[PDB]
Every structure is written in C-alpha cells, then in structure tokens.
Amino acid sequence: TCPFYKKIPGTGFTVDAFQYGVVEGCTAYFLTHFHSDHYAGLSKHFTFPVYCSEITGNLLKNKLHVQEQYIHPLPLDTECIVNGVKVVLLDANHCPGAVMILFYLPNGTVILHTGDFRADPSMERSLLADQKVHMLYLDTTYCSPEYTFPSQQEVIRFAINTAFEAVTLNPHALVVCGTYSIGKEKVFLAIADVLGSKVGMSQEKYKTLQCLNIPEINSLITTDMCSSLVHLLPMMQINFKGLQSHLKKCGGKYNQILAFRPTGWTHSNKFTRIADVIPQTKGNISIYGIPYSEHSSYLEMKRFVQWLKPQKIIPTVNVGTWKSRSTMEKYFREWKLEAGY
Numbered sequence: 001t002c003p004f005y006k007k008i009p010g011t012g013f014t015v016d017a018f019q020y021g022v023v024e025g026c027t028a029y030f031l032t033h034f035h036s037d038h039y040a041g042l043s044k045h046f047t048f049p050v051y052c053s054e055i056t057g058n059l060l061k062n063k064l065h066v067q068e069q070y071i072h073p074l075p076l077d078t079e080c081i082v083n084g085v086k087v088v089l090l091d092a093n094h095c096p097g098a099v100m101i102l103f104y105l106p107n108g109t110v111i112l113h114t115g116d117f118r119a120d121p122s123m124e125r126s127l128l129a130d131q132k133v134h135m136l137y138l139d140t141t142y143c144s145p146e147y148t149f150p151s152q153q154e155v156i157r158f159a160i161n162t163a164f165e166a167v168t169l170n171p172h173a174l175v176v177c178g179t180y181s182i183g184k185e186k187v188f189l190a191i192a193d194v195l196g197s198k199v200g201m202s203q204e205k206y207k208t209l210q211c212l213n214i215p216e217i218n219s220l221i222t223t224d225m226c227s228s229l230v231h232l233l234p235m236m237q238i239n240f241k242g243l244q245s246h247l248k249k250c251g252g253k254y255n256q257i258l259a260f261r262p263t264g265w266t267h268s269n270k271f272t273r274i275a276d277v278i279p280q281t282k283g284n285i286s287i288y289g290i291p292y293s294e295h296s297s298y299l300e301m302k303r304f305v306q307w308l309k310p311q312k313i314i315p316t317v318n319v320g321t322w323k324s325r326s327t328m329e330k331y332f333r334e335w336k337l338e339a340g341y
C-alpha cells in the first residue's frame with residue numbers, strides 16, 4: 001500500500017510509486033529519474049500517464065519498452081499545466097534526466113519534491129527563488145554530520161591525474177571504470193578525454209548511454225573494446241578474480257589495469273582526504289575507491305533547507321526505522337532554530 005510520502009495532497013498525483021499496482025485516485029504517475037528503486041514496477045504494459053523528463057522518457061521507451069503515448073515528457077524550467085495543475089520540472093543535479101518537481105496547488109499551497117538531488121547554490125537562483133514553498137519532500141540519504149565528501153570537480157581532478165600519469169608511464173596499461181546504473185558518467189568521460197580515447201563498453205551499456213542526449217556522444221563512446229583504452233565494466237566485476245578474468249579476454253594487448261570504483265560515502269571518508277587516497281593491490285591490478293557522490297552532503301542539504309525556509313519537511317529516504325525518523329527531526333529542529341523560520 002502506497003506510503004503517504006509518495007502522494008501529493010489535493011491532486012491525483014503520485015511520485016515514484018510504480019510498485020503497488022493501481023493507486024486508487026491517481027490520474028498521473030510522476031517518475032523523478034531512472035534508478036531501479038524509483039521505477040520498480042514499470043513495464044511495456046503500463047497504460048497510465050507517466051510524466052517525466054525527455055531523457056527519462058527515452059529510457060522508459062528503449063530500456064523498459066513503454067508505449068510512446070503513455071510517456072509524457074516535459075521540458076525543464078517551463079511552467080506547464082498538467083490536469084489543471086501548474087507544475088515545473090527542475091534539474092536535480094543527480095543522474096542524467098533526474099528532476100525535482102514544483103507543484104502549485106489550486107488552494108495556494110506550493111510543494112517541492114526533490115526526488116534524489118545533490119543540493120547546490122545554483123538552485124537558489126532558479127524558479128524556486130520566485131515564491132514561498134510550504135512543503136518539502138526531501139532526499140535525506142546523507143542527513144547526518146559525519147557525511148562529508150569532496151566536490152565532484154575535486155574528484156574529477158584526482159581521476160584525470162591518476163589516469164594520465166600511469167598511461168604516460170606505462171602505455172600498455174588499461175584504465176577500467178566500474179558502473180551499475182546511470183550516473184557518474186563524468187568520471188569515465190573525463191578520463192577518456194585526457195587519454196585521447198573513446199570509452200568502450202558492452203552493447204547494453206552503449207544502448208543506455210545513447211538515450212541520454214549527451215552532445216557529440218558518437219565521438220565519445222564505442223562498442224569496439226579492442227580499439228579503446230578506457231573500458232567500462234559491471235561494478236560486481238571490479239575485483240581481482242573478475243579483473244584477472246577480463247585481463248585475459250583482451251588477448252595480450254595490455255599488461256596492467258588501473259581501475260576506479262566511484263562509490264558513495266564509506267567509513268574511510270571519516271579519516272582520509274581525497275588527495276591522500278590509495279588502492280588495494282594484488283599484483284598488476286590496482287583498484288581505486290573514489291567518493292564521487294550524486295547526493296547532498298550534510299552541509300549542502302542544510303544550506304539548501306535553511307535558504308528554502310519550508311513550513312514543513314517530509315523525508316523520503318531512511319524513513320523505515322523510528323530511530324532514523326527521530327534523528328532526522330532533531331536536525332530539522334536545530335536548523336529551523338538557527339535560521340529563525
């Protein structure tokens with residue numbers, strides 16, 4: 001049974017709620033972005049409207065095979081009427097095609113649903129700046145002060161350097177990057193760009209990337225592995241036994257892999273900076289963990305909420321235990337007292 005934090009009051013609208021069957025009263029099903037926890041349930045047999053971004057639309061049509069008519073894509077940054085309710089989609093700074101959604105209720109209430117987001121100061125000069133937001137449905141993935149991590153630009157720097165160093169030192173080494181969903185494309189695109197290569201990948205991953213409206217994408221990616229010196233592999237596969245396995249398949253063309261595992265937070269963020277990172281090493285294979293986050297840090301979230309001064313906050317992440325719920329409320333109360341709203 002659909003939880004109350006996936007419903008929008010005063011509408012027939014639900015958000016990311018595709019796994020409960022038909023939801024009685026729901027005229028419209030919004031999907032914030034193409035990540036399986038959010039889309040769990042969709043298929044070719046869905047005959048209700050889905051409102052989403054164009055890119056999310058492309059992924060629905062091509063990867064899940066939903067029928068063109070039941071996908072309603074919308075442009076971003078554009079006031080749009082949807083069953084006689086004004087809505088806007090806003091860039092969420094999460095993965096490709098990920099959006100936040102502003103709902104303007106007839107009664108005068110204004111609700112922001114963040115989907116998954118990495119909060120940023122550029123959002124403070126968006127359409128959100130123009131009016132009061134009464135309710136906030138919030139991505140609380142990292143709502144605790146331990147959760148610090150570097151900027152994406154800091155991390156891309158490290159990467160571009162590690163990779164380019166080694167390739168110029170040993171020109172028969174391979175760069176690998178791990179992946180399992182959309183997101184974090186900048187990691188491999190940046191490495192390939194500095195090495196003068198295309199990124200090589202499976203047919204299924206090539207298919208996914210060709211739906212993302214990345215400019216000049218035909219010049220950046222290929223399904224020909226042999227021709228390329230940056231390769232993508234399943235994240236499950238980014239380990240010694242599996243990298244060994246893969247190092248065979250290339251057939252005497254490379255004598256060293258240098259892998260990267262972009263991950264979220266891990267407990268070594270609490271004691272080690274980004275300039276001072278190391279890999280695990282079992283012979284000629286070296287696996288880097290690098291903390292490229294597409295979710296708000298604690299400080300980023302805090303700043304965004306304190307600027308927004310919402311009258312009410314409804315968490316969408318870590319809401320399954322009373323302890324987490326209670327911990328989160330305490331932070332929201334601190335923030336509001338500091339800020340005077």
Ligand code: NI
Pocket residue numbers: 033035094116
């Ligand atoms: Ni996500």
